[PDB]
Nucleic acid binder design. Structure first.
Ligand SMILES: [Cl-]
Lengths: 145, 140
DNA sequence: TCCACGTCAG
DNA sequence: CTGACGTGGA
């Protein structure tokens, strides 16, 4: 499974099903929001933001992406591991990450981003949540919204 | 959603995903084994999930859904569909899961059904479908 | 073995 | 709202 741009897939491309991001090699997991891979430190390779968490899409070049897990079953911390750990190490690896957005014909490839930072958030209950600040790599084609 | 043969879909056709039987209108549910409509049955998927019987012949025994196969099973929704399809003598598409994941096996009728007191004490239905004679052959 | 920003239709 | 012969990858 490959980093960066994917042959055949262009910014603004749309898809109906998660299972096509997998087929085309854009995003492997069938449900999970984060896909990553061993480098042996985990690095992130793509994320889907499609309404499942409290993600922030400004219609700008910055997005806040919520970490997975913790029930955001009963309310638990979130954990810096698997996907979450991937995204973080991708802060330092400065590697590009595909970002796919779910739309109100269901998904759109939004292009490449980097993970500038992450932080923690004591939530409305008392448990952790991570937030990863991704910036879109400047100079890619644009999309409407 | 249509009964009988589907335009564009031929016996022996294969597919990788449940979500293509839906796209092509072969079988709507994404997981469920039985699809029906206002109740008569219109298609079933037998892909290893229950103790179905595939003789490599023209008859198949299809297990009813539910009951955790621990509760009885119930003659309702899909199960009820299949049964009323006994009397409606309407054709039913039958898709088989294979060990690139699914294969349209053609048309069948539901000749009968019965009940089976299982290894625990609760119900299970079994529907005997016979393949409509005179369609191309699937090898196995 | 188990979880996950599934996905459909009653 | 939730049950249903789901998928893929850790
Ligand atoms: Cl698909």
């Amino acid at each position: 499974q490959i980093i960066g741009t994917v042959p055949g897939v262009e910014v603004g491309d749309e898809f109906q099903y998660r299972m096509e991001l997998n087929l085309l090699g854009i995003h492997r997991p069938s449900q999970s929001g984060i896909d990553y891979m061993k480098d042996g430190e985990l690095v992130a390779t793509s994320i889907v933001s499609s309404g499942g968490y409290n993600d922030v899409l400004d219609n700008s070049d910055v997005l806040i992406y919520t970490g997975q897990g913790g029930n955001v079953e009963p309310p638990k911390d979130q954990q810096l591991v698997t996907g979450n750990l991937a995204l973080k190490n991708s802060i330092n690896k400065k590697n590009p990450v595909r970002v796919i957005r779910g739309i109100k014909k269901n998904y759109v490839y939004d292009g490449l981003y980097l993970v500038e930072e992450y932080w923690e958030e004591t939530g409305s209950h008392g448990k952790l949540v991570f937030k990863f600040k991704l910036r879109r790599i400047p100079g890619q084609p644009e999309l409407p919204w």
